[PDB]
Design an enzyme around this catalytic site. Structure first.
Site, PDB file in Angstrom:
ATOM      1  N   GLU A 159       0.805  -1.204   0.000  1.00 16.97           N
ATOM      2  CA  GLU A 159       0.000   0.000   0.000  1.00 16.97           C
ATOM      3  C   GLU A 159       0.847   1.266   0.000  1.00 16.97           C
ATOM      4  O   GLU A 159       0.598   2.163  -0.798  1.00 16.97           O
ATOM      5  CB  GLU A 159      -0.951   0.000   1.193  1.00 16.97           C
ATOM      6  CG  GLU A 159      -1.797   1.255   1.293  1.00 16.97           C
ATOM      7  CD  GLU A 159      -2.810   1.416   0.191  1.00 16.97           C
ATOM      8  OE1 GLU A 159      -3.167   0.425  -0.489  1.00 16.97           O
ATOM      9  OE2 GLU A 159      -3.275   2.560   0.017  1.00 16.97           O
ATOM     10  N   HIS A 179       0.967  12.850  -9.144  1.00  8.46           N
ATOM     11  CA  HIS A 179       0.231  14.042  -8.696  1.00  8.46           C
ATOM     12  C   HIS A 179       1.166  15.229  -8.496  1.00  8.46           C
ATOM     13  O   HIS A 179       0.784  16.372  -8.766  1.00  8.46           O
ATOM     14  CB  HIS A 179      -0.556  13.743  -7.422  1.00  8.46           C
ATOM     15  CG  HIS A 179      -1.781  12.920  -7.665  1.00  8.46           C
ATOM     16  ND1 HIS A 179      -3.054  13.358  -7.359  1.00  8.46           N
ATOM     17  CD2 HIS A 179      -1.929  11.691  -8.218  1.00  8.46           C
ATOM     18  CE1 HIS A 179      -3.930  12.437  -7.720  1.00  8.46           C
ATOM     19  NE2 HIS A 179      -3.271  11.407  -8.228  1.00  8.46           N
ATOM     20  N   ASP A 218      -9.171   3.479  -3.240  1.00 10.82           N
ATOM     21  CA  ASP A 218      -9.750   3.661  -1.907  1.00 10.82           C
ATOM     22  C   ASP A 218     -10.897   4.668  -1.892  1.00 10.82           C
ATOM     23  O   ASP A 218     -11.727   4.629  -0.986  1.00 10.82           O
ATOM     24  CB  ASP A 218      -8.670   4.136  -0.939  1.00 10.82           C
ATOM     25  CG  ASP A 218      -7.450   3.255  -0.959  1.00 10.82           C
ATOM     26  OD1 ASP A 218      -7.601   2.019  -1.076  1.00 10.82           O
ATOM     27  OD2 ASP A 218      -6.346   3.822  -0.844  1.00 10.82           O
ATOM     28  N   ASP A 229      -5.872  -4.756 -11.187  1.00 10.02           N
ATOM     29  CA  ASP A 229      -5.600  -6.036 -11.821  1.00 10.02           C
ATOM     30  C   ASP A 229      -5.497  -7.115 -10.764  1.00 10.02           C
ATOM     31  O   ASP A 229      -5.560  -6.845  -9.563  1.00 10.02           O
ATOM     32  CB  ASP A 229      -4.436  -5.992 -12.867  1.00 10.02           C
ATOM     33  CG  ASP A 229      -3.009  -6.117 -12.312  1.00 10.02           C
ATOM     34  OD1 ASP A 229      -2.763  -6.298 -11.098  1.00 10.02           O
ATOM     35  OD2 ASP A 229      -2.105  -6.025 -13.183  1.00 10.02           O
ATOM     36  N   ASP A 249       3.495  -6.378 -13.800  1.00 10.86           N
ATOM     37  CA  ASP A 249       3.294  -7.265 -14.947  1.00 10.86           C
ATOM     38  C   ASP A 249       2.257  -6.660 -15.896  1.00 10.86           C
ATOM     39  O   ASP A 249       1.789  -5.539 -15.704  1.00 10.86           O
ATOM     40  CB  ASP A 249       2.877  -8.663 -14.473  1.00 10.86           C
ATOM     41  CG  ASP A 249       1.618  -8.646 -13.623  1.00 10.86           C
ATOM     42  OD1 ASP A 249       0.906  -7.612 -13.605  1.00 10.86           O
ATOM     43  OD2 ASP A 249       1.335  -9.668 -12.961  1.00 10.86           O
TER      44      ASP A 249
HETATM   45  C1  HEM Z   1      -5.262   9.389 -17.037  1.00 17.01           C
HETATM   46  C2  HEM Z   1      -4.373   9.397 -16.033  1.00 17.01           C
HETATM   47  C3  HEM Z   1      -4.686   8.738 -14.689  1.00 17.01           C
HETATM   48  C4  HEM Z   1      -5.866   8.599 -14.067  1.00 17.01           C
HETATM   49  C5  HEM Z   1      -7.265   9.083 -14.467  1.00 17.01           C
HETATM   50  C6  HEM Z   1      -5.626   7.885 -12.834  1.00 17.01           C
HETATM   51  C7  HEM Z   1      -6.569   7.539 -11.897  1.00 17.01           C
HETATM   52  C8  HEM Z   1      -6.345   6.853 -10.721  1.00 17.01           C
HETATM   53  C9  HEM Z   1      -7.334   6.571  -9.701  1.00 17.01           C
HETATM   54  C10 HEM Z   1      -8.804   6.996  -9.783  1.00 17.01           C
HETATM   55  C11 HEM Z   1      -6.741   5.877  -8.729  1.00 17.01           C
HETATM   56  C12 HEM Z   1      -7.391   5.370  -7.426  1.00 17.01           C
HETATM   57  C13 HEM Z   1      -7.211   6.380  -6.290  1.00 17.01           C
HETATM   58  C14 HEM Z   1      -8.078   6.003  -5.116  1.00 17.01           C
HETATM   59  O1  HEM Z   1      -9.322   6.144  -5.237  1.00 17.01           O
HETATM   60  O2  HEM Z   1      -7.554   5.556  -4.057  1.00 17.01           O
HETATM   61  C15 HEM Z   1      -5.354   5.721  -9.098  1.00 17.01           C
HETATM   62  C16 HEM Z   1      -4.408   5.050  -8.376  1.00 17.01           C
HETATM   63  C17 HEM Z   1      -3.074   4.938  -8.683  1.00 17.01           C
HETATM   64  N1  HEM Z   1      -2.424   5.582  -9.723  1.00 17.01           N
HETATM   65 FE1  HEM Z   1      -3.391   6.317 -11.407  1.00 17.01          FE
HETATM   66  N2  HEM Z   1      -4.284   7.587 -12.748  1.00 17.01           N
HETATM   67  C18 HEM Z   1      -3.674   8.113 -13.860  1.00 17.01           C
HETATM   68  C19 HEM Z   1      -2.336   8.061 -14.141  1.00 17.01           C
HETATM   69  C20 HEM Z   1      -1.361   7.536 -13.322  1.00 17.01           C
HETATM   70  C21 HEM Z   1       0.067   7.650 -13.553  1.00 17.01           C
HETATM   71  C22 HEM Z   1       0.712   8.401 -14.738  1.00 17.01           C
HETATM   72  C23 HEM Z   1       0.684   7.024 -12.535  1.00 17.01           C
HETATM   73  C24 HEM Z   1       2.188   6.837 -12.257  1.00 17.01           C
HETATM   74  C25 HEM Z   1       3.106   6.784 -13.233  1.00 17.01           C
HETATM   75  C26 HEM Z   1      -0.343   6.499 -11.664  1.00 17.01           C
HETATM   76  C27 HEM Z   1      -0.113   5.733 -10.556  1.00 17.01           C
HETATM   77  C28 HEM Z   1      -1.073   5.251  -9.708  1.00 17.01           C
HETATM   78  C29 HEM Z   1      -0.834   4.313  -8.647  1.00 17.01           C
HETATM   79  C30 HEM Z   1       0.477   3.620  -8.294  1.00 17.01           C
HETATM   80  C31 HEM Z   1      -2.136   4.126  -7.963  1.00 17.01           C
HETATM   81  C32 HEM Z   1      -2.424   3.178  -6.817  1.00 17.01           C
HETATM   82  C33 HEM Z   1      -2.324   3.772  -5.427  1.00 17.01           C
HETATM   83  C34 HEM Z   1      -2.651   2.702  -4.408  1.00 17.01           C
HETATM   84  O3  HEM Z   1      -2.979   1.553  -4.808  1.00 17.01           O
HETATM   85  O4  HEM Z   1      -2.558   3.022  -3.200  1.00 17.01           O
HETATM   86  N3  HEM Z   1      -1.576   6.835 -12.155  1.00 17.01           N
HETATM   87  N4  HEM Z   1      -5.133   6.329 -10.305  1.00 17.01           N
HETATM   88 CA   LIG Z   2      -0.165  -6.416 -11.732  1.00 20.09          CA
HETATM   89 CA   LIG Z   3       4.164  19.673  -8.073  1.00 16.65          CA
END
Ligand code: HEM
Ligand SMILES: [Ca+2]
Ligand SMILES: [Ca+2]
Length: 367
Positions: A37, A48, A181, A193, A200
């Protein structure tokens, strides 16, 4: 001149050596060597922090990868698009005083690099150091949200840093180790996934399956039907069912991005290298690399890719695919045995009881 660090690491610049103890402390105090996590939230924070920059609005709109999330924790983390980012922000803030020679911008990106290294199959990303230690808060409206359409997403990334559609899909490989979350107010840690602790290509395959239901509520903004919605949370368990984001579905089927999306299915090295290149570009938004120093040698060597082939999860198969890419045939892959959906573990050790480090701090969130 070259130097050798505390731990025997040879670097191009002795100032890179300050990152060795930072990495050790990030692991001992927060990440605990796991692709769990806290690692995932820190990787989310790199995005962000970095993406809040705009070519068209000019420098006043945001400084990109500048630590603004940590330095002004009462501003950007509380904008709606960043709800939930408080956890990572509050986990990193103490390192600013513990390692006072390292800027907030550098701390965010280095922590992301270290976090990635804990995830089997992740690349050893570039790390350049030297981001200035001061900035101002970005404006609201610069972070893509899951309800956004592909035109909007592509424009935002192009405006942030000239990312191409391929680079955008490459960055979204990060959703291979991602859970939600806040998207569903009734669910915690809903994975994107079936292998949220493994870097992966399962995410790429699994978004292309036909959706059949929802792991929680059926009407959340930014969410669409999932191919594997069940979990054990209706009986008090923590293995939440799989969630699908509207934005991931949209990228998987849009003519500008669908072939790049499918192109990562069962292409582990291509995926990891493509993510690495796009991610290195993300990590230096707001900076001329001429003004930075290469400290890539102090990024830990990542956990190796797993042996397991890319496969269809239990109860799914090629008959369930919704395909959009004419340019490349979807590969023949094995199907995992089983008559019912396999619960997606809440923890990297396969169990449900793991807990995560969380420091208190000034950033906040909501529901
Ligand atoms: C169109 C662009 C993107 C959208 C709309 C998006 C959207 C989201 C959303 C809705 C979540 C879930 C947050 C929550 O409700 O807790 C998330 C999680 C996450 N995002 Fe993306 N994301 C985008 C791009 C990216 C990029 C560019 C990265 C990093 C290179 C990234 C890395 C992550 C990671 C690692 C999580 C998981 C956090 C966790 O499991 O605690 N995201 N994202
Ligand atoms: Ca995976
Ligand atoms: Ca900044």
């Amino acid at each position: 001149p070259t130097a050798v660090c505390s731990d025997g690491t040879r670097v191009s610049n002795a100032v890179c050596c300050d990152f060795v103890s930072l990495g050790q402390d990030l692991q001992s105090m927060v990440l605990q060597g796991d692709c769990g996590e806290d690692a995932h939230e820190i990787i989310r924070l790199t995005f962000h922090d970095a993406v809040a920059i705009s070519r068209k609005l000019g420098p006043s709109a945001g400084g990109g990868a500048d630590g603004s999330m940590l330095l002004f924790p009462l501003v950007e983390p509380e904008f709606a698009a960043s709800n939930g980012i408080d956890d990572s922000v509050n986990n990193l803030i103490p390192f600013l005083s513990l390692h006072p020679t390292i800027s907030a911008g550098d701390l965010v990106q280095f922590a992301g690099a270290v976090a990635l290294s804990n995830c089997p199959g992740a690349p050893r990303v570039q790390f350049l150091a030297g981001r200035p230690n001061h900035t101002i808060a970005a404006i609201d409206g610069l972070i893509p949200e899951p309800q956004d359409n592909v035109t909007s997403i592509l424009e935002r990334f192009d405006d942030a840093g000239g990312f191409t559609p391929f680079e955008v899909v490459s960055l979204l490989a990060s959703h291979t180790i991602a859970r939600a979350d806040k998207v569903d107010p009734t669910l915690d840690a809903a994975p994107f996934d079936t292998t949220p602790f493994t870097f992966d290509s399962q995410i790429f395959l699994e978004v292309l399956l036909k959706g059949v239901g929802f792991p929680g509520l059926d009407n959340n903004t930014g969410e669409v039907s999932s191919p594997l919605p069940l979990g054990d949370t209706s009986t008090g368990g923590k293995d939440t069912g799989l969630m699908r984001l509207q934005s991931d579905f949209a990228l998987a089927h849009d003519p500008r991005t669908a072939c790049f999306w499918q192109g990562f299915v069962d292409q582990q090295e291509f995926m990891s290298q493509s993510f690495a290149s796009a991610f290195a570009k993300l990590a230096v938004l707001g900076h001329n690399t001429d003004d930075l120093i290469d400290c890539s040698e102090v990024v830990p060597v990542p956990k190796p890719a797993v042996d397991k082939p890319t496969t269809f999860p239990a109860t799914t198969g090629p008959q369930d695919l919704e395909l959009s890419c004419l340019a490349e045939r979807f590969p023949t892959l094995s199907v995992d045995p089983g008559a019912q959906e396999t619960l997606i573990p809440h923890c990297s050790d396969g169990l449900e009881n793991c807990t995560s480090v969380q420091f208190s701090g000034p950033a906040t969130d909501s529901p």
